[PDB]
Amino acid sequence: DEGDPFFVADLGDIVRKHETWKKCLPRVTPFYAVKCNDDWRVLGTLAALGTGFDCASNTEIQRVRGIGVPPEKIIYANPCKQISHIRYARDSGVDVMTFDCVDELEKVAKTHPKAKMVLRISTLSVKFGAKVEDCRFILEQAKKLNIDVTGVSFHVGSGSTDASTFAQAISDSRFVFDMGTELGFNMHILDIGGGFPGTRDAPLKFEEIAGVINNALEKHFPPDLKLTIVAEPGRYYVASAFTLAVNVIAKKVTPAQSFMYYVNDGVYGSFNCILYDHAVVRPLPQREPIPNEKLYPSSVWGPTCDGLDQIVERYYLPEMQVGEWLLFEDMGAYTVVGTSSFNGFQSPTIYYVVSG
Amino acid sequence: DEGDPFFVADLGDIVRKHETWKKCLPRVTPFYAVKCNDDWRVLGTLAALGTGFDCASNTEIQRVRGIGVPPEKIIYANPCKQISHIRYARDSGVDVMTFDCVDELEKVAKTHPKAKMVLRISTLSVKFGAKVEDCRFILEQAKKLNIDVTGVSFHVGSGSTDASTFAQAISDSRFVFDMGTELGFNMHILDIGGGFPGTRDAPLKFEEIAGVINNALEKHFPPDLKLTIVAEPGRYYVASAFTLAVNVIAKKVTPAQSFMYYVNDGVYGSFNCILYDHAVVRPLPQREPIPNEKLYPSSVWGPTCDGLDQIVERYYLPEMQVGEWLLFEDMGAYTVVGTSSFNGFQSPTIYYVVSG
Ligand SMILES: *Cc1c(COP(=O)(O)O)cnc(C)c1O
Numbered sequence A, B: 001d002e003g004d005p006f007f008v009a010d011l012g013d014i015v016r017k018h019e020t021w022k023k024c025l026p027r028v029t030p031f032y033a034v035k036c037n038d039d040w041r042v043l044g045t046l047a048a049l050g051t052g053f054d055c056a057s058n059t060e061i062q063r064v065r066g067i068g069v070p071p072e073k074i075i076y077a078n079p080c081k082q083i084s085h086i087r088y089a090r091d092s093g094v095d096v097m098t099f100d101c102v103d104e105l106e107k108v109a110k111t112h113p114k115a116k117m118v119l120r121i122s123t124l125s126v127k128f129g130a131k132v133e134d135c136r137f138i139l140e141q142a143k144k145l146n147i148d149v150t151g152v153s154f155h156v157g158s159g160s161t162d163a164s165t166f167a168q169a170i171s172d173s174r175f176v177f178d179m180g181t182e183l184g185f186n187m188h189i190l191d192i193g194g195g196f197p198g199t200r201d202a203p204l205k206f207e208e209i210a211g212v213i214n215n216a217l218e219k220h221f222p223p224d225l226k227l228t229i230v231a232e233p234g235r236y237y238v239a240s241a242f243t244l245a246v247n248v249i250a251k252k253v254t255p256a257q258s259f260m261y262y263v264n265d266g267v268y269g270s271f272n273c274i275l276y277d278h279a280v281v282r283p284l285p286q287r288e289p290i291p292n293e294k295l296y297p298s299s300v301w302g303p304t305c306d307g308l309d310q311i312v313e314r315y316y317l318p319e320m321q322v323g324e325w326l327l328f329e330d331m332g333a334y335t336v337v338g339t340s341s342f343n344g345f346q347s348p349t350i351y352y353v354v355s356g
């Protein structure tokens, strides 16, 4: 008994993803954003395909060093680091960090003085990113601190509706790159960040994005042996690789006929993505559709005792039975990584497949 | 170095809270809601003051049995339980569960047939609670299933502005109580739920609520040796016992003068309460106020790489320095229990004091 929830993860989906990356963005070396999903098999698979890693804390630095990815394949791309975490990266070989302001540079001068610093420009956030107005002052201050500033990076953010933002960002990157060189800094890295779609049927497809990037790149950043273009794709690699199966643990009928299904993972667990990632989810019954079937408005609710722990407000389902299974596809990204064990509940075991 | 964040927890605040409970609600035996905060010291202190426990899963049932609380001090107050979790509670001596619908009673008939079932009525939620219109049918179905229905419960929810709700709820509980008796059921438990304030300066104070409850109680549920009144207070006991100190790990100045403070816990961590609990928090500087001090609009931001990980949008603060400490009071409730280690960050160690 105990029909516990579980993920099937398809590591082959990760390989196919990489294959397309390489074909649509051959100038660009991906540093996987480990905060997306840091499952050990997903890390090892990506390590094996020869991906870089984008890590955001000492813990993520340890985990990828744990699988014997050398330091050079890691960018520590967190603009605001605790000073001891910098210390750690300095002790692990990790030397490329980012920053977006001068205060951090002062930290860096005092803690990791030969680090290769990448300057991140706003694009995404009030939280992160230098405005391009402030870069000259920033870069003059960098000079007084004797910082080795070696490139520019931005981060369009995880749901653009127009690809132009990349193109805008890249142009902006050329301007600050140029101030970089003007003031004597050895600028040779362009990091175009994260945000690509990880489900191959999003509205704005990966391929358009790759095309606008490539046109921008050719116009502002002509190939050069001194220049490396890099990115920090997160959901790209993993969104659609993981599928969740959840058991309907409880059932309510309202007499019009509507159903309430209670399942055994929810917004404190894998569906935290509804709260923190703006995710919308589609419940699929794993029983195969039966010809003519009656379908009724349904809510599905997670196991916790909280009224806000709700996964779906009104979705057409066949009449379901306690002990049956709902599938949610595309549950690779920002899903295991945000879970909590609020209320006693424990998160889904992961099972792994290789689509050969 | 590594100015890690940490909680000071004052177990004596728990004892004081218990003393007040007993003085203002002497007819009522509290079953602490362990999902609120299941820290081992908070459980052991409550268990020693002689509290009951409200548990919602097999894990919370284990934890409180782990500290040698016998089964009878446990109510398993989750209306919609996974059938193997029922099985567990049956194997651990836990026999009082609740329910709000007939579907569950079918499960209970099949899994834990001699269980003392408490019927929970809506009050709180679309998610939980039987409408009072449906209780007669519900209770007739219970009888067919041979359920031992032994009482009524409700749950006003965690932030009422008028205490009348309890009074309303209690009246309603008398109605379903009375159908219970009419149909041959041994009704002797009234569980008035959770929702009381846990900071002794909320707008609607504990004491008004205790007064409305007691009036309602004396009017609809006169003292009787056969009747036990019970409750499920969660934040009551712990909200104000815990104080969070967080290190400012990063600083931004905007030239009017405003500041951005980045600290090393945030909404994937102890401030998940902003997202899931409707919490508002007040950042206090731990340096003592200096006479005349200049104060400026400030945001404080959590360590994570997400733009939505923001703690405070505009709060007046003295100018702060990297390496200083912000204190957040009242951070007992729905704070450690929701945390995740999104992005590599690890949650605050807790330190314990006894206000003697
Ligand atoms: C959040 C993040 C990423 C990854 O975002 P995706 O949309 O998953 O590709 C990459 N880089 C930085 C700096 C980020 O914050």
Ligand SMILES: *Cc1c(COP(=O)(O)O)cnc(C)c1O
Binding pocket: A305, A306, B033, B036, B054, B077, B155, B157, B158, B193, B194, B195, B196, B232, B233, B234, B235, B236
């Ligand atoms: C959430 C909950 C509680 C405790 O809520 P508080 O506001 O912390 O007192 C008690 N009982 C049930 C059934 C709950 O869902």
